[PDB]
RNA sequence: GGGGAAACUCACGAGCGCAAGACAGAGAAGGGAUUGACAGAUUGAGAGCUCUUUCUUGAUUCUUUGGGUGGUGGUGCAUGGCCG
């Protein structure tokens, strides 16, 4: 008998994850792609994000 | 946590048919294709990988398992007189080898 | 020669009025601040109702020997109800339970407002 | 009319992320034959993954093991047994020109206890040989 | 460099045990009458009773399955003093072994 | 001989219905099933040294319209199901003696000629 | 003459490839007789910007990575029959190049 | 430290419950291993959590002796990767 995952992980820091690293801290970049900074920076070239600032 | 017998059966089967099983790192949700309590799918799949009939791979949000040769032997032993004429998809056909040569 | 806010009795009849259904009859509603009214008119819990009755038994059974049975709770979010006056409820803060004698004045106010959640600072170095 | 309409922005970002999903998926499992990349042509009809490797032979698998393992594995996350999601393994013509590959070659030699210098030399020579115009190798770590 | 961890348990909170479900030997719920017919002992749940017996509390009828709870009013005072008497036979014999 | 096909087809079926959830294991289990009239077939271990055991059993069987056969030792039952003290290798030693088996349904992979063998030993 | 106005939409992550489809779709449509083409029109280039603090652990000065993904959308209009289009769409267009079509009369 | 903390996050404090202790050796088990649970009594809490109580359930397991999982726990002076 269990009764966890009771508290409403409905909105905010806990209802978010990084598709990859899975963390919740690093700016979970909502712009459509759930990713923290660190992880995104890694995938940038694979997702398709050039630099040339 | 008890794992229903039919749950067990239903599961080992969904595998033996395909020879492949997939699961997410989530514990509350229900396995996609089978609609089973994941916690149950975890309890069930792990005993396999652990003894050695299952191969595991993990990427982003999912765990990937492909059945082992020694595994079909195990499942068929557990499923009974039903599992004998079973050929996990991943195990036989070889229709037309197709390692593509780049565009014309 | 001292009196009380709006008549401790009018309210017992106001709260336990013809329809003493939801702990806070729409009557008491007219009395509370917007924030409180918000909550009740929104979605108040039932647990808050069984806690209610727990004080009830404490207030009567106890002889006039003014020795109330402390009722323990974590429901620091509860807003004192009229009938909740007189009883001593033990409210958790962080470490233990706090016993507070409910006066007429602490109504409409959050039950948490008395269970000190931290010991402010003394000093020296 | 494909289900839901999506911000060409929103849907494109989704596209990229999916591609980067595939990349972790393949590279992590296809850790035997020279893995390289993926030309993915997605149609509301058929998702076509094209894995490029140094040793395509390894991708197809034995009896057709991996080929089916991967094709099925994908079917498990975004399935469509309708042969929709079909995989193809491309041959990487010049082995020595693919770094993704050479690293694996080096990764292999190092775990087989081949000393560092001797190691790197073989890969570097082999790389230049294949037509490289310049090659470099780095190996940070608790070197002996 | 962070504070250390540790573990000092109160002698008071001590520990707490968990339930230990129990079957007593086998369970012969039936009786053989006229050795040609078979008889019933407990009561049978109405809903799911084609083989399930309800648990007879000291005054309430429980069903291991449907949880249906029943008790007769007039039979409550009668069974309450009958069960409490059988509760004393069990209360005295339990204190004797210790 | 103990009609090889009777005992042989028995264990192939006791293990066939056990590989599927539709099988009943236990005294509590069977007595419960027997009543619900959910047992298309019930077995009883004869060498059962428990008071009124086998009795109360055969008792209900008829009282609820159930076909029934008895097998010599309880031990031979343990095997038909799969209840021994096995070993991560296969090497067994000692086995558990049931006394109450009941099939809720016949697995659909059982032959018409084998089904008749079974009804070829039903009783009280 | 069953004329159908066709809308060719092309959206792409990089300009290299989307310009080839555009350039060739017209090159190919002009050359058919049952064809009427509205010049290849270039919608405004949408840019998705993602600015990120480099380093994982927040130490060292402020370093920011300005990442960009450009999306070029080109639109072409056609005067044809239903077979005519499928005749001109017979290219060999690069990956990640979405092509949507709208048919009206 | 994407550090804008109401909870969550969370690591910290008080109190409470779940095991998701697999896999192996040995002992246990259908004449039951074990889950669940009205009802009062306890709780902060309709947490069987706990006690009294007795009925369900089916070997998914108990038990020890090993031995794992998982861990925002420790060493950035053991290290990759990354960044200043
Ligand atoms: Mg370094
Ligand atoms: Mg701070
Ligand atoms: Mg906490
Ligand atoms: Mg570890
Ligand atoms: Mg970790
Ligand atoms: Zn991440
Ligand atoms: Zn019932």
What's the rounded Cα separation, in Å, for the pair G54 and A41? 8
Shortest Cα distance from D15 to chain G (angstroms)?
8
Contacts of D51 in chain G (CB under 8 A): none
Residues 6 or more apart in contact with residue G24 via CB below 8 angstroms:
G91
What's the rounded Cα separation, in Å, for the pair B43 and B4? 11
What's the rounded Cα separation, in Å, for the pair B17 and C47? 50
Q: Which helix (H) or strand (E) holds D76?
A: helix D65-78
The backbone region for E55, taken as left when phi is positive above 0, alpha when psi lies in -120 to 50, beta otherwise, is beta
The residue written with tokens 């996990």 in the block is: B88
What are chain C's partners, defined as 3 or more CB pairs within 8 angstroms?
Answer: none
Contacts of G54 in chain A (CB under 8 A): 41
Give the resolution in Å.
3.9
D96: buried, middle or exposed (CB in 10 Å: 19+, 13-18, 0-12)? buried
Q: Which helix (H) or strand (E) holds C57?
A: helix C47-61
The residue written with tokens 């001593």 in the block is: C88
What's the rounded Cα separation, in Å, for the pair B18 and D81? 11
What's the rounded Cα separation, in Å, for the pair D62 and D51? 17
What's the rounded Cα separation, in Å, for the pair E46 and E39? 17
Residues 6 or more apart in contact with residue C23 via CB below 8 angstroms:
C15, C44, C48, C49, C52, C81
Q: Which helix (H) or strand (E) holds B22?
A: strand B20-24
End-to-end alpha-carbon separation of chain E, Å?
A: 54
The residue written with tokens 């709770």 in the block is: C73
Q: Looking at the DSSP assignment, which residues form a beta bridge with residue B65?
A: B21, B56
Q: Compute, in angstroms, the gap from residue G21 CA to the centroid of ligand 2.
A: 54
What's the rounded Cα separation, in Å, for the pair C104 and C85? 6
Q: Compute, in angstroms, the gap from residue C35 CA to the centroid of ligand 3.
A: 27
Tell me, yes or no, whether chains B and A touch by having 3 or more C-beta pairs under 8 A: yes
Tell me, yes or no, whether chains A and G touch by having 3 or more C-beta pairs under 8 A: yes
Distance F90 CA to H65 C1' (A): 22
For residue A48, give the nearest of G15, D101, B58, D47 by alpha carbon.
G15
What's the rounded Cα separation, in Å, for the pair F68 and F65? 10
Smallest CA–C1' separation from E61, nucleotide: H38
Are residues F63 and F46 in contact, defined by beta-carbon separation less than 8 angstroms? no
What's the rounded Cα separation, in Å, for the pair A33 and A11? 17
Structure tokens given for F23: 């099988």
Are β-strands G97-104 and D35-38 bridged in parallel, bridged antiparallel, or unpaired?
unpaired
Structure tokens given for D117: 């210098």
Are residues C25 and C32 in contact, defined by beta-carbon separation less than 8 angstroms? no
For residue F69, give the nearest of F80, F54, F84 by alpha carbon.
F54
Q: What experiment produced this structure?
A: X-ray
CA of B6: how far to CAs of B24, B27, F27, G88, in Å? 22, 20, 22, 56
CA of A26: how far to CAs of A30, C21, D14, G57, in Å? 11, 48, 20, 10
Shortest Cα distance from F21 to chain B (angstroms)?
6
Residues 6 or more apart in contact with residue G65 via CB below 8 angstroms:
A41, A51, A53, G51, G52, G53, G54
In G, what residues contact D, Cβ < 8 A?
11, 13, 46, 48, 69, 71, 73, 95-96, 98
Strand intervals (E) in chain D: 35-38, 41-42, 47-53, 86-91
Structure tokens given for D102: 């050479």
Q: DSSP letter at F23?
A: E
* Three-state secondary structure call for residue E18: coil
Structure tokens given for C99: 């016993």
What's the rounded Cα separation, in Å, for the pair C13 and C20? 9
Q: Compute, in angstroms, the gap from residue E54 CA to the centroid of ligand 7.
A: 8
Are residues G76 and G23 in contact, defined by beta-carbon separation less than 8 angstroms? no
Q: What angle do CA G52, G54, G58 make, to 5 degrees?
A: 105
Are residues D69 and B90 in contact, defined by beta-carbon separation less than 8 angstroms? yes
Structure tokens given for G61: 């000065």
What angle in degrees, to the nearest 10, is found between the helix axes of B38-51 and B5-18? 60
Query: Secondary structure of B36-74 in the HEC alphabet?
Result: CEHHHHHHHHHHHHHHCCEEEEEECCEEEEEECHHHHHH
Helices vs strands, H then E, count in chain A: 1, 0
For residue D54, give the nearest of D94, D108, D111, D110 by alpha carbon.
D94
CB neighbourhood size of C15 (10 A): 18
Are residues D56 and B99 in contact, defined by beta-carbon separation less than 8 angstroms? yes
Residues 6 or more apart in contact with residue G57 via CB below 8 angstroms:
none
Residues 6 or more apart in contact with residue G17 via CB below 8 angstroms:
G93, G94, G95, G96, G97
* Three-state secondary structure call for residue D23: helix
Q: Compute, in angstroms, the gap from residue A4 CA to the centroid of ligand 2.
A: 29
Are β-strands D35-38 and C97-101 bridged in parallel, bridged antiparallel, or unpaired?
unpaired
G83 phi and psi, to 5 degrees?
-75, -35
Smallest CA–C1' separation from E5, nucleotide: H73
Total number of residues shown for chain B: 104
Output D126-130 pairs: Cβ under 8 A, ≥24 positions apart. D126/D96, D126/D102, D127/D96, D127/D97, D127/D102, D128/D96, D129/D96, D130/D94, D130/D95, D130/D96, D130/D97
What's the rounded Cα separation, in Å, for the pair E74 and G3? 91
Q: Which nucleotides of H are covered by protein (CB under 7 A)?
A: 1-3, 7-10, 12-20, 22-39, 43-61, 72-75, 78-84
Are β-strands D86-91 and D47-53 bridged in parallel, bridged antiparallel, or unpaired?
parallel
* Three-state secondary structure call for residue B97: coil
Are residues G71 and G11 in contact, defined by beta-carbon separation less than 8 angstroms? yes
Are residues B88 and B17 in contact, defined by beta-carbon separation less than 8 angstroms? yes
Smallest CA–C1' separation from F100, nucleotide: H30
What per-residue string of b and e applies to B49-62 under the rule 16 or more CB within 10 Å gives b?
eeeebbbebebbbb
Distance of CA G49 to the CA centre of its chain: 20
The residue written with tokens 């080096």 in the block is: D106
What's the rounded Cα separation, in Å, for the pair A28 and E15? 42
* Three-state secondary structure call for residue C98: strand
- DSSP for D79-107 reads --TTTTSEEEEEE-S-GGG-HHHHHHHHH
Give the strands of the sheet with B54-59, arranged side by side: B20-24, B62-67, B54-59
Are β-strands B54-59 and D86-91 bridged in parallel, bridged antiparallel, or unpaired?
unpaired
**Inter-chain CB proximity E23 and F59 less than 8 Å:** no
CA of G90: how far to CAs of D17, F100, G83, G87, in Å? 29, 73, 11, 6
The backbone region for C50, taken as left when phi is positive above 0, alpha when psi lies in -120 to 50, beta otherwise, is alpha
For residue B98, give the nearest of D38, D36, D89 by alpha carbon.
D89
What's the rounded Cα separation, in Å, for the pair C6 and C32? 12
Q: Which helix (H) or strand (E) holds F77?
A: helix F75-81
What's the rounded Cα separation, in Å, for the pair C43 and C49? 13
B40 phi and psi, to 5 degrees?
-70, -45
What's the rounded Cα separation, in Å, for the pair D94 and B19? 35
Q: DSSP letter at B30?
A: B
What's the rounded Cα separation, in Å, for the pair G32 and B54? 59
Are residues D88 and D48 in contact, defined by beta-carbon separation less than 8 angstroms? yes
What's the rounded Cα separation, in Å, for the pair D130 and D97? 6
Structure tokens given for D97: 């020109």
What's the rounded Cα separation, in Å, for the pair D91 and D86? 17
What's the rounded Cα separation, in Å, for the pair D94 and D107? 19
Residues 6 or more apart in contact with residue B43 via CB below 8 angstroms:
B1, B3
Q: DSSP letter at E56?
A: E
What's the rounded Cα separation, in Å, for the pair D17 and A32? 10
- DSSP for chain G reads ---EEEEEEEEES-HHHHHHHHHHHHHHHHTSTT-EEEEEEE---EEEEEEEE-SSSS-SS--EEEEEEEEEEEEEEEEE-HHHHHHHS-S---SSEEEEEEEE-
In A, what residues contact D, Cβ < 8 A?
19-20, 31-33, 35, 43, 46-49
For residue A5, give the nearest of B37, B27, B25 by alpha carbon.
B27
Contacts of F13 in chain B (CB under 8 A): none
Taking the CA atoms of chain A, what radius of gyration do you get in angstroms? 15
């Amino acid at each position: 008998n269990k009764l966890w995952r009771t508290h409403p992980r409905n909105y905010g820091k806990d209802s978010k994850e990084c598709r990859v690293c899975g963390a919740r801290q690093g700016l979970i970049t909502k712009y459509e792609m759930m990713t923290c900074r660190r992880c995104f920076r890694e995938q940038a070239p694979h997702i398709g994000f050039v630099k040339y600032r | 946590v008890h794992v229903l017998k039919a749950t067990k059966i239903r599961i080992y089967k969904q595998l033996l048919q395909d020879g492949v099983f997939v699961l997410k790192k989530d514990f509350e949700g229900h396995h996609e294709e089978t609609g089973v309590p994941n916690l149950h799918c975890y309890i069930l799949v792990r005993s396999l990988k652990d003894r050695g009939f299952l191969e595991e791979i993990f990427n982003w949000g999912f765990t990937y398992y492909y059945l082992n040769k020694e595994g079909c032997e195990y499942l068929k032993t557990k499923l009974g007189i039903s599992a004998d004429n079973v050929i996990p998809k991943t195990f036989k056909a070889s229709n037309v080898n197709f390692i593509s040569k780049e565009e014309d | 020669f001292t009196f009380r806010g709006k008549g401790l009795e009018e309210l017992t009849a106001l709260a336990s009025g013809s329809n003493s259904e939801k702990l806070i009859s729409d009557e008491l509603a007219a009395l509370f601040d917007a924030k409180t009214r918000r909550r009740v008119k929104r979605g108040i819990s039932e647990k808050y109702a069984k806690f209610v009755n727990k004080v009830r038994r404490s207030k009567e059974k106890c002889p006039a020997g003014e020795k109330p049975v402390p009722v323990k709770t974590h429901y620091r979010s509860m807003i004192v109800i009229p009938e909740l006056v007189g009883g001593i409820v033990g409210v958790y803060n962080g470490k233990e339970f706090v016993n507070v004698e409910v006066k007429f004045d602490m109504i409409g106010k959050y039950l948490a407002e008395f269970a000190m959640t931290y010991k402010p600072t003394t000093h020296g170095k | 009319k494909t289900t839901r309409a999506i911000n060409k922005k929103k849907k494109f970002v989704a596209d990229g992320v999916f591609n980067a999903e595939l990349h972790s998926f393949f590279s992590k499992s296809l850790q035997d034959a020279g893995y390289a990349g993926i030309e993915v042509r997605r149609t509301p009809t058929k998702t076509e993954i094209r894995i490029k490797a140094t040793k395509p032979q390894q991708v197809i698998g034995v009896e057709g093991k991996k080929h089916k393992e991967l094709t099925q594995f994908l079917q498990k996350r975004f399935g469509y047994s309708d042969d929709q999601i079909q995989i193809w393994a491309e041959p990487i013509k010049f082995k020595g020109l693919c770094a993704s590959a050479q690293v694996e070659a080096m990764n292999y030699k190092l775990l087989k206890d081949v000393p560092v210098r001797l190691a790197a030399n073989y890969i570097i020579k082999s790389v230049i040989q294949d037509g490289a115009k310049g090659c470099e190798i780095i190996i940070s770590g608790k070197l002996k | 460099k962070k504070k250390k961890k540790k573990k000092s348990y109160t002698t008071k909170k001590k520990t707490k045990h968990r339930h230990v479900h129990t079957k007593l030997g086998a369970l012969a719920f039936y009786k053989l009458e006229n050795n040609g017919k078979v008889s019933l002992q407990q009561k049978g749940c109405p809903k799911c009773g084609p083989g399930i017996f309800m648990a007879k509390h000291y005054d309430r009828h429980y069903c291991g399955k449907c949880h249906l709870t029943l008790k007769i009013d007039x039979x409550x005072x009668x069974x309450x003093x009958x069960x409490x008497x059988x509760x004393x036979x069990x209360x005295x014999x339990x204190x004797x072994x210790x | 001989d103990q009609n090889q096909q009777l005992n042989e087809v028995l264990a192939k079926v006791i293990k066939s219905s056990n590989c599927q959830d539709a099988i009943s294991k236990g005294l509590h289990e069977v007595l419960r099933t027997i009543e619900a009239k959910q047992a298309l077939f019930v077995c009883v271990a004869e060498d059962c040294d428990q008071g009124n055991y086998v009795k109360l059993v055969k008792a209900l069987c008829a009282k609820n319209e159930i076909k029934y056969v008895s097998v010599p030792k309880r031990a031979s039952l343990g095997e038909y199901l799969g209840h021994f003290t096995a070993n991560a290798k296969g090497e067994i030693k000692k086995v558990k003696g049931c006394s109450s088996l009941a099939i809720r349904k016949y697995a659909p992979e059982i032959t018409e000629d084998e089904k008749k063998i079974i009804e070829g030993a039903l009783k009280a | 003459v069953k004329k159908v106005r066709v809308r060719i939409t092309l959206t792409c992550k990089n300009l290299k490839s989307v310009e080839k489809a555009t350039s060739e779709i017209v090159s190919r449509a002009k050359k058919t007789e049952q064809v009427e083409v509205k010049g290849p029109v270039r919608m405004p280039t949408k840019t998705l910007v993602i600015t990120v603090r480099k380093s994982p652990c927040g130490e060292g000065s402020k370093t920011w990575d300005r990442f960009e993904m450009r999306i070029y959308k080109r639109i072409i209009d056609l005067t044809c029959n239903v077979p005519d289009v499928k005749t001109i769409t017979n290219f060999r267009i690069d990956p990640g190049v979405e092509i949507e079509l709208t048919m009206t009369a």
